[PDB]
């Protein structure tokens, strides 16, 4: 390890990057609703 503190700070920065990629999938999932709702309409 290194100092049980400098390595712990790196884990908090990696968790913030997962929220950005996860937020893009939530917005893309709602977009599918409009495309799935427009394709089901008569």
């Amino acid at each position: 390890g290194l100092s049980k503190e400098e390595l712990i700070q790196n884990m908090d920065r990696v968790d913030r990057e997962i929220t950005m990629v996860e937020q893009q999938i939530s917005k893309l999932k709602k977009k599918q609703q409009q495309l799935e709702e427009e394709a089901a309409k008569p």
Partner: protein, 38 residues
């Protein structure tokens, strides 16, 4: 039948949403690597 050409375009959009599942799972695997050194 009819009303099928619109269903073919939705299949292409699902391929981009399915790839996000592999990109979102790879991001969580990166943080797991830090635990091995934590």
């Amino acid at each position: 039948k009819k009303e099928m050409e619109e269903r073919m375009s939705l299949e292409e959009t699902k391929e981009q949403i399915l790839k996000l599942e592999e990109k979102l799972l790879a991001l969580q695997e990166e943080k797991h690597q830090l635990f091995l050194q934590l």
